[PDB]
């Protein structure tokens, strides 16, 4: 079973898009009704178990292509829409709890909403990957939901975040480091899915070890990116990433030891296994330290180990082979340092699905824009 720590969904205040005197004629005033309802619908799906990617993809697409007229220019003369600052939007943040923050910037809405959509795909993926029944086509669905979420986040960070006039506030969802932390985690989680698959399809030990090593690295690299944050809100989540890094370094040494045993290097296989078991114990302690850290989102539990399955057997095969010049119990002669892993994954590495917002709705014309008439 897969267990993915989840921070809560962002929440927002309703927006009616009612400008009264500003808006004129059916066209413009009809656009404001569509935004009203598209945003309303898109906000409902977030909490709806019924909702699938096909439904979400359609809701978001609709709303964003309409909201895109508050950001982009229609003509290529001007750089940007004249409506950008017309509306005050209000949003909470994954790590900040009940406390919201407002900006009257349409771009602030685009990124907060787009962020939530991304956040949705990962939550949809985790419910899914949590099932015991989980099938192949469903596993692939999780792998994919994660790569989409990742590509969305990445796109916010790269092409969008730079445009906000309000400077980035540490701890808020809308700052660079934190979005980067989400992008990494998503890739990290897609690779876990692959690792389970590779262990189940009985793929080569070297392949698994490498993909496990690369995965632990993404987790370490994520935790690092969050190290700039204050402990209050970031502590539990960081304890989780630390936990996931240990878990997968355990797997790395475990499957790597098998590699070593096959190469007839006994003191090293033994040493690789001891570090695997050692890191797993570390991971269990962290899992305890994690369960006891207060912060955003509920705690999750791993359970469901396949690990000592594999471990018990490698330990059995190593000793059966290595008593010889090494065992039986008090061990000689074993390297003091754990065998260093620079392992390179040729298979399983996940990259984000490149994402882009829809162009401006066809409902947007120089005329229907001019029907707004600020003044």
């Amino acid at each position: 079973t897969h267990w993915f720590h989840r921070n809560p969904l962002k929440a927002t205040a309703p927006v009616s898009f009612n400008y009264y005197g500003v808006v004129t004629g059916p066209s413009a005033s009809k656009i404001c009704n569509d935004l009203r309802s598209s945003r309303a619908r898109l906000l409902e799906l977030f909490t709806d178990l019924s909702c699938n990617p096909e439904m979400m993809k359609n809701a978001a697409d609709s709303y964003f292509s309409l909201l895109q007229g508050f950001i982009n220019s229609l003509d290529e003369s001007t750089q940007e829409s004249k409506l950008r600052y017309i509306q005050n939007f209000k949003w909470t943040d994954t790590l900040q709890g009940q406390v919201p923050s407002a900006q009257q910037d349409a771009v602030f809405e685009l990124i907060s909403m787009g962020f939530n959509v991304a956040l949705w795909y990962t939550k949809y993926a985790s419910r899914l990957a949590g099932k015991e029944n989980i099938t192949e086509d469903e596993a692939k669905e999780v792998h994919r939901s994660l790569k989409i979420a990742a590509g969305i986040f990445k796109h916010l960070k790269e092409s969008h975040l730079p445009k906000l006039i309000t400077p980035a506030e540490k701890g808020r969802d809308l700052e660079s480091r934190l979005i980067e932390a989400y992008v990494i985690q998503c890739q990290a989680e897609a690779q876990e899915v692959t690792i389970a698959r590779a262990i189940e399809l009985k793929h080569a030990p070297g392949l698994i070890a490498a993909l496990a090593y690369e995965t632990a690295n993404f987790y370490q690299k994520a935790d690092h990116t969050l190290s700039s944050l204050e402990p209050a809100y970031s502590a539990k989540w960081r304890k989780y990433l630390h936990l996931k890094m240990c878990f997968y370094t355990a797997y790395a040494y475990c499957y790597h030891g098998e590699t070593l045993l096959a190469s007839d290097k006994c003191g090293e296989a033994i040493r690789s296994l001891q570090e695997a078991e050692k890191l797993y114990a570390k991971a269990e302690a962290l899992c305890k330290e994690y369960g006891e850290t207060k912060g955003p989102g509920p705690t999750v539990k791993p359970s469901g180990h396949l690990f000592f399955r594999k471990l018990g057997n490698l330990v059995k095969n190593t000793l059966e082979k290595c008593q010889r010049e090494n065992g039986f119990i008090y061990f000689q002669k074993i390297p003091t340092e754990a065998p260093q892993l620079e392992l390179k994954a040729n298979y399983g590495l996940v990259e984000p699905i490149p994402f882009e917002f829809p162009p401006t709705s066809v409902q947007w014309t120089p005329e229907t824009l001019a029907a707004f008439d600020l003044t």
Binding site: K140, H143, T194, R197, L201, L207, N346, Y347, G348
Partner: peptide, 17 residues
């Protein structure tokens, strides 16, 4: 589907058995 090396790959990027 084949990676850069011409090896067949499944949807997950793993080789085909």
């Amino acid at each position: 589907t084949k990676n850069k090396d011409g090896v067949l790959v499944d949807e997950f990027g793993l080789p085909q058995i």
